[PDB]
Design a protein around this ligand. Structure first.
Ligand SMILES: CCCC(=O)OC[C@H](COP(=O)(O)O)OC(=O)CCC
Length: 501
């Protein structure tokens, strides 16, 4: 079974980060999209899960995701590995962890558990590692004595604004849930205006790849607990820091296959974990582009740092995913552009790839969060543009820079671009009155290969992770369950750019 899209991505990653293969990125065969029997598309865990229901009575997607998290942890024989943006998991998310651990201990196991969050410098952490550990111990009750906890909050770079943004739940190195959902009450659990998000569940060797990736983050975290400005660490039962928990669990034999799905795991190390991939020959033609009305003051790691690429293969992974599309690409995001300053407004190479596809007649669709979404720096569902023209107009100038003339750029822009903000029903806003917020980090290409993960397409220099799947059957489930319903309702919020019929 051919995988032309995974092949193009694999070439990009091996030229970018050959040294990081097997830790920060890895291609595997034999994975299974982990759907419960009777629900073939249940591996796709969308939230809140109320397509075409403006009042969203039944938050059935959020209940399936928590149910799935609880069940995967309950099955744990050996290791539980959790990462997210701060805060530590609370609400139903903590209940899922606590309930799962009690069940695993009750089945006679003594699981080791890593819970890592990334914290921004300006962010104040109400519940710190030691307090969170203590809450866990208390709710676990008698079971705590059999549970080895490592809990840690971390920040890799104050100046380059870098900390963990990956959203992972890996159990025994063989099941993995990942995506864009924060294990964080307020965003998804207790509001009549809940953010729209998506996760996926798999099993197989690509779960071990996620495990390896978290070992990389914990090697750094354990070592840099020597600097409490960077790492806060708490363990239970006198346990040591466990930097290589996933490698110890893997052992010598290679991961066993669970199905037939080929997957590329790929993350990135942000800034301040590893300066560069010492074995990488990557030497790119970095784009000479200016920006209309923003210049980043910080050093532009997205658009002008070779070394950053070599330790962040996810950014080239996403670009070569779009580059790989022969027919059509769907981009469903919270944002394509970033707030500038502090970060660059956009990823030049990404917009050049998109423009190149518009000029080749490849259909491009961009659905982002509504610009009416104002939030704080990390609100989730917030928008970082004031208008959708800040995407189309950028696509235009990058088209003119390529095609030569503006007329040719209009036949490309108006002919091949669909640009909208997110809706999940016929209502323009929630029946709550507040607007729809989108939190996807999703790219789909030719209904064959897709990315689901935590890594946004807008510039951020955080540590992220995600999976690229190539499977015509799985992209078809993705199209039916998410992409078609998304466009069915977000086209009522479509943009028609400047200079177009
Ligand atoms: C600031 C540059 C990194 C960034 O942009 O951070 C976005 C992230 C949320 O990202 P997202 O989930 O909305 O895509 O917020 C945070 O990590 C900071 C919260 C205090």
């Amino acid at each position: 079974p051919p995988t032309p899209h995974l092949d193009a991505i694999e070439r990009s990653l091996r030229d970018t980060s050959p040294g990081l293969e097997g830790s920060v990125w890895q291609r595997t065969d034999g994975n299974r999209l982990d759907a419960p029997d009777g629900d073939p598309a249940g591996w796709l865990l969308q939230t809140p899960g109320c397509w075409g229901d403006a009042g969203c009575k039944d938050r059935a997607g959020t209940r399936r995701l928590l149910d799935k998290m609880t069940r995967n942890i309950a099955d744990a024989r050996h290791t539980v590995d959790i990462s997210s943006l701060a805060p530590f998991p609370n609400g139903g998310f903590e209940d899922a962890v606590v309930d799962g651990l009690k069940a695993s201990v009750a089945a006679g196991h003594s699981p080791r558990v890593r819970i890592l969050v990334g914290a921004a410098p300006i962010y104040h952490l109400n519940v710190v590692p030691s307090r969170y550990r203590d809450e866990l111990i208390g709710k676990l009750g008698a079971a705590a004595g059999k549970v080895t906890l490592n809990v840690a909050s971390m920040t890799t770079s104050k100046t380059s604004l870098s900390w963990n943004h990956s959203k992972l739940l890996v159990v025994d190195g063989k099941t993995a849930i990942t995506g864009g959902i924060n294990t964080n009450k307020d965003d998804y659990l207790d509001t009549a205006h809940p953010v729209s998000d998506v996760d996926m569940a798999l099993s197989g060797p690509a779960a071990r790849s996620a495990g390896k990736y978290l070992d990389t983050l914990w090697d750094w975290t354990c070592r840099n607990a020597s600097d409490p400005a960077k790492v806060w660490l708490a363990t239970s039962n006198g346990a040591s820091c466990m930097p290589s928990m996933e490698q110890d669990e893997a052992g010598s034999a290679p991961a066993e296959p669970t199905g037939d799905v080929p997957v590329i795991a790929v993350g990135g190390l942000g800034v301040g974990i590893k300066e560069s991939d010492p074995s990488s020959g990557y030497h790119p033609d970095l784009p000479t582009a200016p920006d209309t009305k923003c210049t980043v003051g910080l050093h532009d790691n997205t658009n002008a740092d070779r070394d950053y690429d070599t330790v962040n293969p996810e950014e080239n992974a996403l670009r070569s995913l779009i580059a790989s599309a022969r027919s059509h690409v769907e981009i469903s995001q919270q944002d394509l552009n970033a707030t500038c300053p502090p970060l660059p407004r956009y990823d030049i190479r990404t917009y050049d790839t998109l423009a190149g596809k518009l000029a080749a007649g490849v259909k491009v669709r961009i659905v982002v969060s509504d610009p009416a979404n104002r939030g704080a720096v990390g609100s989730g569902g917030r928008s970082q543009i004031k208008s959708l023209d800040e995407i189309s107009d950028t696509l235009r100038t990058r088209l003119v820079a390529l095609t030569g003339d503006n007329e040719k750029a209009s036949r490309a822009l108006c002919g091949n671009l669909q640009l909208a903000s997110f809706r999940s029903s016929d209502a323009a806003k929630w029946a709550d009155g507040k607007p729809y917020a989108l939190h996807h980090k999703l790219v789909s290409v030719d209904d064959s290969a897709f990315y689901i993960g935590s890594k946004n397409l807008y510039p951020a220099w955080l540590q992220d992770f995600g999976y690229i799947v190539e499977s015509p059957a799985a992209a078809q489930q993705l199209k039916t369950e998410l992409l078609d319903p998304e466009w069915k309702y977000s086209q009522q919020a479509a943009a028609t750019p400047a200079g177009c019929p």
